[PDB]
Design an enzyme around this catalytic site. Structure first.
Site, short mmCIF file in Angstrom:
data_model
loop_
_atom_site.label_atom_id
_atom_site.label_comp_id
_atom_site.label_asym_id
_atom_site.label_seq_id
_atom_site.Cartn_x
_atom_site.Cartn_y
_atom_site.Cartn_z
N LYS A 1 -1.27 9.80 -10.05
CA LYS A 1 -2.48 8.95 -10.03
C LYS A 1 -3.65 9.55 -9.18
CE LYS A 1 -2.50 4.59 -8.42
NZ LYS A 1 -3.07 3.26 -8.07
N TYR A 2 -3.37 9.95 -7.95
CA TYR A 2 -4.39 10.47 -7.08
C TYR A 2 -4.80 11.90 -7.47
CZ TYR A 2 -3.01 6.22 -4.52
OH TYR A 2 -2.69 4.92 -4.14
N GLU B 1 -10.10 1.85 -7.29
CA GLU B 1 -8.79 1.69 -7.90
C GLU B 1 -8.48 0.18 -7.75
OE1 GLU B 1 -6.12 3.40 -4.97
OE2 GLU B 1 -4.37 2.38 -5.83
N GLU C 1 -7.32 -7.94 -11.63
CA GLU C 1 -7.49 -7.94 -10.17
C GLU C 1 -8.98 -8.16 -9.86
OE1 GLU C 1 -5.55 -4.46 -8.31
OE2 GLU C 1 -3.56 -5.23 -8.88
N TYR D 1 0.85 -1.20 0.00
CA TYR D 1 0.00 0.00 0.00
C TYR D 1 0.87 1.23 0.00
CZ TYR D 1 -4.29 -2.69 1.27
OH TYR D 1 -5.33 -3.57 1.28
#
Ligand SMILES: Nc1ncnc2c1ccn2[C@@H]1O[C@H]([C@H](O)c2ccccc2)[C@@H](O)[C@H]1O
Ligand SMILES: Nc1ncnc2c1ccn2[C@@H]1O[C@H]([C@H](O)c2ccccc2)[C@@H](O)[C@H]1O
Lengths: 325, 303, 300, 325
Positions: free
Chosen positions: A21-22, A123, A132, A12
């Site tokens: 990304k964020y 995500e 995933e 994480y």
């Protein structure tokens, strides 16, 4: 496999080291909030936002930053099935977030939501987009999104490209382990920073998913045929996999080399090997077939080369590789 | 009130003193900081509201148990391995540390003041039982009689050399410090709580890890009842001439029993483990419970 | 030279505790990952629905510190071999919870007790965690040379201590370890954290541990004698055992409170360093063979 | 494994060759119908009977025969997840049964029943009682049984007995297969007609299940310790498994040697081997530990010998053997 397995604290931590990304997720939420609440409804309209698979809280923080810059009111739920990450979330909730954030320790597919959402933010993407199991997860969460609700991401597409690498072929070959099929290592994908290789044809789209899914009974199983023109004499050793995602409208993320997102580095391509190397002459076409398969317990890929020569079908019935549901 | 701004979520102990003031013990068993606090509420109905206490103080580590030492002293069993003595100032507005002696090698789980009020007994996860001199702030004797954690120690109401202890080694020991070998084994499921009968000198009750409450007489057969579905955390007799027995459990309930151990009252008010119960010295039919749900409940018991 | 750790059961503030422990000269800290008194319910309402964080955040330390400076400890209430079905079930769920948090944190080692003969269910739960995901971490079974029941003071009038020699009986804790590791099928991740008492058992009990994977030796402060100057020291017999353990390159663990109150705490650790420095220098063979100890090779 | 796998036509044919088993089920249904409907309510009270796991229809026929001999009115549902057997059932329903029988092609755990049942009848038992996952199946079907409803079977118990057989030890030893753990054959049960062997102690009860289950959240996981007195010098090679079941009241079925049901022959004992043979001296006790474990996908057994010597725990985490849910 963040669904079947509980990710470690440092995993994480590596995800969180991506500032771009964020800031992309924040821009997507910011634009969505503005499109859903007119300026006149600013102080009366509270949007219900659900972060589905909240990890250690970056999308929760991205949602709060987005609501502040949009000057809109939000009610957040942070849903996470990993109880270890739930510890981080509950410590953040007590110390900083407060009542604005409701931490839910649950699988999004089982959660009995007390309210419907305006926006679901997630995500859940792998290097091959759906590897995933984001489609399955968001399909089960779909029933608590309002009829006019928005899912961020709205869409994603996987891409494949034929590659030559006698170096990587040998690397896969050395992955033979005791007490399993001696050729299982060729029937499974690998996340790898491809370096000593030759891309033999332009990446082409493989599988696409859209959220929310409005095609009753969904059917996340897929079968795709791809024809790759090859302009060189070479040897085919496998397929590089990449993806692209539409967070909201024009706000996207991509690991496809030609459209790679700026400074998004924790994300390496995926490699689908083939058991036997295939000679390809200049002007020939490589034809590959990819299947996305499932049962109620597992999801897997099966693949085969049908031109210029046939290969065996790789990973039949997920005999060597499966993704746990 | 010159005290900590917030008391910890997990309420561990509640004890009324002669005038009806309520002493609370609390620990934070989760979050960033794992400490504790001590509080005095001259108005017990305001408890656990911090801004309405008479006094409050922060301890370095958690409070596993506490007890009054007369009217102004407070003896604490700490997570640190220390037995602490705190004292109310002459104005009763501050709680000041008198001694902090680190004598145990693990968490001090249980504490009990002997008849005289000049000595106390402590039990620990370190398997030892210690006899303390409260004035000289020293351990008089250290006993390693048990073979596992000491769960509960309980001083005799009127005999200063007599106390009971129980442990995870499945032993209930009757002590008499006047004897060369001071412990004696009293004759299933692990014993978890002890309470001497306030009128009958050789009688006591014990709770076990399986929810059973038993009546025992030092002489000899035992009277018992399956009161709780889980561990019996505490047993407290009422102040009445014919006492009632409050029992509390990890099953989040409080039961009030009679002489024959039959149920007279039951409360399911707590949403977490019930940790202590104390009977009001002013109104004998009021029983106060504290739990990990951060509730201070005042029960009206039918007499 | 000597790798040593501090064992604590009370950590009010993780950052402050670690700093104090490192200042004392220790290389690591054995500590609870969940509050040792914070008993948790997994099956029965209302307690199973207890809110708030179940423990402190992983964000309190860096990943490097969790990976190198912290040894996890199983909560003392976790009793997987309890005679009570409810305790057994809550303990299985709590053990899996604590082990999984340790793996989440990336702890280098995790301490579990062997404090009774039957640890069948503890072995079952541990074997099941070992066959679930990330296979790096070490499990240190905390087992004493002498069982608490066999070193209790002879102070129970109607239960005297046995003054007779029980040859196999005094070797009972080795059988606790043997059965446990047999059950877990000799996992290379399962080692011994041997706990040393105030009085050592007979040589046959000590020699019983020869050939065993001892990764740590636990030294309670209470076993230390006091010298004329008032500083903690060890008996000649204890020193003889320390020297044997130093050849096995065990990590030493200092447990319990400061019993040498008017002599500071790092003094216990300073003594271990003294013993380590004042040992016989390795001979020509020992210096030559350094690196090859128990390293299997094909005969030329 | 009739849950994870679809049984073949000839397998169902062998089950049906037992005349005693179904005459026992018929007697159990007959007695239950009489106890639920008084003589005066004979023509007004229609009992709702559900055959859960109907196979090719013998319990449906047993239920109809039972209702005729009890002179009571029944409404039948025949629930079957195997679509191949559903073909036999639907051909029987058209040709013979008619409207009295409603054939349902469904998993009993997913079926949205249109009515609640008075009696649920099932034959989901293995040689070790719960090894075909009857507890899980009936637990999921429980919600459609009325509050005063009866399940046939009402209860079942598995039994274990230590055995000596160097012949069977060698037989298990020869089951080493390529591409799997070389000792996996010792970590799995076998259905076997035990012949050249020595029973070392009397069978003792292992695990019990009761239907309907009125202990909230059920918990079908189990842990049992058994102490077997051995009066001979011998070598321990494994554990023989048997079972008993209470269909209704005094009407039972058993494969336990000492209480074996008359003429019930398609049912052989189960064998739990141990990796290493254990020497047992006269007067010693064999102590075995058995666990029934599960996750949301699989159920398995783990076992260990702790006296006179310890063995390794066999089948940890179902590494060698699992029963699919
Ligand atoms: N069906 C489900 N219901 C609830 N949570 C779910 C799922 C499935 C997955 N997740 C969670 O999504 C997160 C995501 O993969 C992620 C990975 C790495 C960094 C940040 C977020 C993980 O934290 C994972 O545990
Ligand atoms: N969860 C479920 N829902 C619906 N049906 C279910 C299950 C689980 C099992 N079965 C069926 O039970 C029968 C039984 O094992 C049987 C076996 C042999 C002969 C006669 C009957 C099989 O026909 C099997 O297919």
């Amino acid at each position: 496999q963040p669904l079947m397995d509980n990710l470690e604290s440092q995993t994480y931590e590596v995800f969180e080291k991506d500032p771009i990304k964020y800031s992309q997720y924040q821009q997507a939420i910011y634009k969505c909030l503005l499109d859903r609440v007119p300026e006149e409804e600013k102080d009366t309209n509270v949007q219900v936002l659900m972060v589905l698979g909240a990890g250690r809280g970056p999308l929760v923080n991205a949602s709060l930053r987005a609501a502040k810059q949009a000057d809109r009111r939000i009610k957040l739920y942070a849903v996470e099935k990993n109880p270890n990450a739930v510890v981080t979330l509950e410590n953040w909730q007590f110390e900083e977030w407060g009542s604005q954030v409701t931490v839910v320790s649950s699988d999004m597919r089982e959660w009995v939501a007390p309210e419907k959402a305006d926006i679901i933010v997630s995500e859940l993407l792998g290097s091959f987009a759906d590897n995933e199991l984001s489609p399955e997860c968001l399909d089960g969460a779909q029933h608590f999104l309002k009829d006019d609700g928005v899912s961020i991401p709205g869409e994603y597409t996987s891409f494949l490209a034929p590659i030559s690498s006698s170096k990587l072929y040998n690397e896969v070959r050395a992955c033979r382990e005791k007490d399993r099929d001696p050729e299982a290592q060729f029937e499974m994908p690998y996340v790898v920073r491809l370096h000593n290789f030759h891309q033999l044809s332009a990446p082409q789209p493989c599988f696409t998913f859209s959220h929310p899914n409005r095609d009753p009974m969904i059917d996340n199983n897929r079968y795709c045929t791809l024809e790759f023109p090859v302009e060189v004499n070479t040897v085919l050793h496998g397929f590089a996999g990449y993806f692209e995602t539409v967070l909201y409208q024009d706000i996207t993320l991509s690991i496809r080399p030609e459209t790679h997102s700026p400074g998004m580095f924790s994300w390496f391509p995926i490699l689908f090997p083939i058991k036997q190397p295939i000679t390809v002459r200049e002007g020939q076409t490589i034809c590959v077939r990819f299947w996305r398969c499932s049962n109620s317990k597992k999801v897997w890929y099966e693949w085969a080369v049908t031109a210029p020569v046939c290969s065996a079908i790789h990973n039949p019935t997920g005999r060597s590789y499966t993704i746990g549901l | 009130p010159n005290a900590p701004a917030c008391m910890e979520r997990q309420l561990e102990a509640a004890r009324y003193r002669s005038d009806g003031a309520l002493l609370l013990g609390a620990s934070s068993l989760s979050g960033r900081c794992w400490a504790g606090s001590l509080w005095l509420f001259k108005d017990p109905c305001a408890a656990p509201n911090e801004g309405f206490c008479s006094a409050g103080v922060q301890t370095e580590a958690g409070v596993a148990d506490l007890t009054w030492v007369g009217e102004r002293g407070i003896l604490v069993a700490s997570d640190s391995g220390a037995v602490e003595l705190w004292e109310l100032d002459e104005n009763e507005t501050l709680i000041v540390s008198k001694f902090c002696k680190y004598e145990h090698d693990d968490i001090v789980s249980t504490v009990s003041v002997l008849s005289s009020g000049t000595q106390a007994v402590s039990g620990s996860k370190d398997i030892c039982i210690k006899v303390w001199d409260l004035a000289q702030q020293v351990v008089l004797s250290s006993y390693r009689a048990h073979a596992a954690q000491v769960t509960c120690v309980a001083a005799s109401p009127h005999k200063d050399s007599v106390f009971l202890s129980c442990s995870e080694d499945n032993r209930i020991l009757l002590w008499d410090t006047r004897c060369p070998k001071p412990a004696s084994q009293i004759g299933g499921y692990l014993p978890t709580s002890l309470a001497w009968h306030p009128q009958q000198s050789e009688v006591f009750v014990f709770g076990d890890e399986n929810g059973t409450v038993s009546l025992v007489d030092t002489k000899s057969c035992v009277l018992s009842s399956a009161v709780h579905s889980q561990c019996v955390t505490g047993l407290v007799f009422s102040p009445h001439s014919v006492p009632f027995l409050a029992s509390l459990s990890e099953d989040c309930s409080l039961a009030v029993l009679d002489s024959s151990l039959s149920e007279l009252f039951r409360s399911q008010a707590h949403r977490d483990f019930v940790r202590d119960a104390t009977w009001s010295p002013l109104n004998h039919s009021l029983l106060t419970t504290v739990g990990w749900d951060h509730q201070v409940v005042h029960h009206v018991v039918p007499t | 030279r000597v790798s040593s750790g501090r064992d604590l059961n009370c950590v009010p503030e993780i950052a402050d505790t670690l700093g104090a422990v490192a200042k004392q000269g220790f290389d690591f800290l054995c500590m609870p990952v969940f509050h040792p008194r914070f008993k948790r319910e997994f099956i029965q309402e209302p307690a199973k629905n207890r809110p708030g964080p179940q423990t402190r955040s992983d964000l309190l330390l860096s990943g490097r510190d969790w990976n190198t400076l912290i040894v996890g400890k199983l909560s003392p209430w976790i009793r997987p071999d309890s005679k009570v079905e409810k305790i057994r079930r809550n303990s299985e769920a709590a053990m899996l919870q604590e082990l999984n948090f340790g793996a989440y944190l990336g702890l280098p080692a995790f301490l579990l007790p062997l404090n009774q003969e039957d640890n069948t269910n503890l072995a079952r739960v541990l074997t099941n965690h070992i066959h679930t995901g990330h296979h790096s971490s070490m499990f240190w079974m905390r087992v004493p040379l002498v069982a608490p029941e066999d070193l209790r003071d002879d102070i129970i009038e109607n239960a005297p201590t046995t003054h007779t020699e029980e040859y196999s009986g005094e070797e009972k804790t080795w059988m606790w370890w043997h059965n446990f590791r047999t059950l877990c099928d000799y996992s290379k991740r399962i080692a011994v954290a041997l706990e040393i008492g105030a009085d050592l058992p007979s040589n046959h009990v000590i020699d019983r541990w020869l050939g065993e994977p001892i990764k740590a030796a636990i030294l309670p402060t209470s076993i230390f004698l006091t010298n004329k100057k008032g500083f903690p020291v060890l008996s000649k017999m204890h020193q003889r055992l320390i020297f044997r353990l130093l050849k096995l390159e065990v990590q030493f663990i200092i447990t319990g409170t400061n019993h040498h109150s008017e002599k500071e705490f790092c003094s216990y650790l300073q003594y271990l360093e003294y013993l380590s420095q004042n040992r016989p220098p390795p001979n020509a063979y020992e210096l030559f063979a350094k690196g090859y100890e128990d390293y299997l090779q094909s005969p030329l």
